[PDB]
């Protein structure tokens, strides 16, 4: 007997343009991010959290 849960959906961060065009300079609609320092153990590894 196989029981399977399934769903078709998508979660996105609402970002809207600010320039002349429709997809120009994207600002977050209602989110403010703050990057701070912490003493806790890292969750994302250095290789994974690096740029590119």
């Amino acid at each position: 007997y196989g029981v399977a849960v399934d769903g078709i959906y998508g979660v996105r961060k609402i970002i809207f343009g600010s320039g002349s065009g429709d997809t120009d300079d994207l600002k977050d609609h209602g989110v403010v991010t703050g990057f701070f320092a912490t003493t806790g153990a890292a969750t994302v590894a250095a290789a994974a959290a690096a740029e590119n």
Partner: protein
């Protein structure tokens, strides 16, 4: 995909008195955001003897 819309505010000086408005109308700017949907699922399979035990 589904496209959601945002209507920008109007920031033109109000036309006061008996001044013409038929030509000095504002333009309404709108923005769009497209969100894609994907299928995600998981499954668990169990034998009948495991159900009985």
């Amino acid at each position: 995909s589904i496209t959601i819309a945002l209507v920008n505010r109007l920031n033109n000086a109000a036309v006061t008195g008996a001044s013409t408005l038929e030509g000095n109308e504002e333009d309404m700017t709108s923005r769009s955001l497209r969100i894609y949907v994907d299928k995600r699922r998981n499954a668990v399979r169990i034998a009948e003897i495991s159900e009985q035990r």
